[PDB]
Swiss-Prot record, chains A, B:
<comment type="subunit">
    <text>Homodimer.</text>
</comment>
<feature type="binding site">
    <location>
        <begin position="64"/>
        <end position="65"/>
    </location>
    <ligand>
        <name>glutathione</name>
    </ligand>
</feature>
<dbReference type="GO" id="GO:0006629">
    <property type="term" value="P:lipid metabolic process"/>
</dbReference>
<dbReference type="InterPro" id="IPR003080">
    <property type="entry name" value="GST_alpha"/>
</dbReference>
<keyword id="KW-0443">Lipid metabolism</keyword>
<comment type="function">
    <text>Conjugation of reduced glutathione to a wide number of exogenous and endogenous hydrophobic electrophiles. Catalyzes isomerization reactions that contribute to the biosynthesis of steroid hormones. Efficiently catalyze obligatory double-bond isomerizations of delta(5)-androstene-3,17-dione and delta(5)-pregnene-3,20-dione, precursors to testosterone and progesterone, respectively. Has substantial activity toward aflatoxin B1-8,9-epoxide.</text>
</comment>
<feature type="domain" description="GST N-terminal">
    <location>
        <begin position="1"/>
        <end position="80"/>
    </location>
</feature>
<dbReference type="InterPro" id="IPR050213">
    <property type="entry name" value="GST_superfamily"/>
</dbReference>
<dbReference type="InterPro" id="IPR040079">
    <property type="entry name" value="Glutathione_S-Trfase"/>
</dbReference>
<dbReference type="InterPro" id="IPR004046">
    <property type="entry name" value="GST_C"/>
</dbReference>
<feature type="binding site">
    <location>
        <position position="6"/>
    </location>
    <ligand>
        <name>glutathione</name>
    </ligand>
</feature>
<feature type="domain" description="GST C-terminal">
    <location>
        <begin position="82"/>
        <end position="204"/>
    </location>
</feature>
<dbReference type="GO" id="GO:0006805">
    <property type="term" value="P:xenobiotic metabolic process"/>
</dbReference>
<feature type="binding site">
    <location>
        <begin position="51"/>
        <end position="52"/>
    </location>
    <ligand>
        <name>glutathione</name>
    </ligand>
</feature>
<keyword id="KW-0007">Acetylation</keyword>
<comment type="similarity">
    <text>Belongs to the GST superfamily. Alpha family.</text>
</comment>
<feature type="binding site">
    <location>
        <position position="42"/>
    </location>
    <ligand>
        <name>glutathione</name>
    </ligand>
</feature>
Length: 218, 218
C-alpha cells in the first residue's frame, strides 16, 4: 500500500489523493503534526530535498508532487496511449496547476492584497481557463478530455472545478460542457466513493489549520 | 524544424533551447518584440492559455514549459528507459526547477528584500540542492544521473550549474562530482556548440531587458 506523508490537510498532497482514489488504489497516510515529525523524516534521509509531499510506493520514496503524479498516472494507465496524448494531457494539467496555485496561495496574501487577488482569479477563470477547457471538450464532443478515455487530466480538472465552486459557484455558470464533465466524473464509482463523507478527501484550510501548518514547516 | 515563440531573452524558454540543442535538433525562433506581436498570437488562437512559451512541433502548438520539455525528452530518447527511471528523472528535475525559480525571480525582489533572498538562495544551494545531486552521483559512481546514459536531468542540471556560477562561483566548490559532470556534459559536441559564442543560448537579463519584457506582457 502506498503511504502518503504530509500534514493533515489539502496543501500540495490533495491532487495525489484524488488520483490514487480515482485509480481505485488503497493508500495509507502518516500525518506530520509537529516540526519534530518533519524533523524525523528529514533526518532519516527520506526527503531528497527535505520537503514533503513524499510518497512511499513500489520501494521508492518519491518526493516532488509532479514526479509522484506522473508515476501514478503511468502505472495505472491514466497518462494516455502515446507521446502526443501525453503532450495534450501535460499541457492541460499545467494550465490547471497555474489556476490552482493562485487559489492555494490566496491565504498568504495580505488583507490589502486579497481583494485584488480574488477578482483576478475570478477574471482569469472566466476569460482564460474555463474557456480553454470548454473548447477542447467542444472540439471533439467526447466524454473525456484526451484519447476518448479516462485520464489524469479529467480527474485534475474536476478536482479544480470543486475548488473553484468553493470560491464562487457562479464562475462555471456559462460553461455547460464543464458542468457535464463534473457530473460524469463525480459519478464514476471510485470518485463517488472519494467524494463521500469520511473519505481521505481533505477540507479547505481554515485559520487554525493554516497557522498550525506554518509552525511545522516554519 | 521546431519553432519557438518567446521574447528575445532567457525567461522560461531557455531550458527548452538547452534541451533541443543538446539533442542536436535545429530549431527556429520568432521573437516577440511588442505587445502587438503577443496580441497577434492570442488572436490567432495559437496560445491555449494566451501565454508563451509556445513551440510549434510535429503539427502541434504546445504551450506550458513542462509540457514542451516532456514531449521533447521522450521524442529524442532523453527520458529514461522506463516508468521508474522517469520517476527519478522527474524528481531530480523538479528540484532543479525549484532552485531555478528562485534565481529567475530574483530581479523582482524589492531592493530592501533582495539581500535576504540572495542569502536564502546561497544557503539552500549549499545545504539543500547541491548536496542532494552530489549524493546521487556518489550513489552509483556513473557519468550520468540516471540509467548511466544521457538524459534531460543531466542537461537541466548543468544549465542550472551555469546559472549558479553567475550568482556566486564559490557555491559549487565543495561538490567535486557536480564539477566533473559540468565539464563532462559541457564537452559533448552538441552542448559545446551551444555554449560557444553566436549560438541561440541567451544572456542574463540586464535592467533594460527586464524593462522591455515587462512592457510586452504587462
Ligand atoms: N515543488 C515541491 C514543493 C514542496 C514544498 O514546498 N513543501 C513544503 C510544504 S507545502 C515544505 O515541505 N516546506 C518545508 C521546507 O521548505 O523546508 C513539490 O511540488 O512537491
Ligand atoms: N506556467 C506557464 C507560465 C507561463 C507564463 O507566465 N508566461 C508569461 C511570460 S514569462 C506570459 O506569457 N505572461 C502573459 C500573461 O500572463 O497574460 C509555463 O511554464 O509555460
Amino acid at each position: 500500500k502506498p503511504k502518503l506523508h504530509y500534514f493533515n490537510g489539502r496543501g500540495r498532497m490533495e491532487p495525489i489523493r484524488w488520483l490514487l482514489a480515482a485509480a481505485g488504489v488503497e493508500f495509507e497516510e502518516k500525518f506530520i503534526g509537529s516540526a519534530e515529525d518533519l524533523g524525523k523524516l528529514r533526518n532519516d534521509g527520506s526527503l531528497m530535498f527535505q520537503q514533503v509531499p513524499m510518497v512511499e510506493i513500489d520501494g521508492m520514496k518519491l518526493v516532488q508532487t509532479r514526479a509522484i503524479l506522473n508515476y501514478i498516472a503511468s502505472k495505472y494507465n491514466l497518462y494516455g496511449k502515446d507521446i502526443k496524448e501525453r503532450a495534450l494531457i501535460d499541457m492541460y494539467t499545467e494550465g490547471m496547476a497555474d489556476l490552482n496555485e493562485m487559489i492555494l496561495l490566496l491565504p498568504l496574501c495580505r488583507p490589502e492584497e486579497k481583494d485584488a487577488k480574488i477578482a483576478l482569479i475570478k477574471e482569469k477563470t472566466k476569460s482564460r481557463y474555463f474557456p480553454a477547457f470548454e473548447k477542447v471538450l467542444q472540439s471533439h464532443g467526447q466524454d473525456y478530455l484526451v484519447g476518448n478515455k479516462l485520464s489524469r487530466a479529467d480527474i485534475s480538472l474536476v478536482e479544480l472545478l470543486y475548488y473553484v465552486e468553493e470560491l464562487d459557484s457562479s464562475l462555471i455558470s456559462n460553461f455547460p460542457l464543464l458542468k457535464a464533465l463534473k457530473t460524469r466524473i463525480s459519478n464514476l464509482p471510485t470518485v463517488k466513493k472519494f467524494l463521500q463523507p469520511g473519505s481521505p478527501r481533505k477540507p479547505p484550510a481554515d485559520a487554525k489549520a493554516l497557522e498550525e501548518a506554518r509552525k511545522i514547516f516554519r
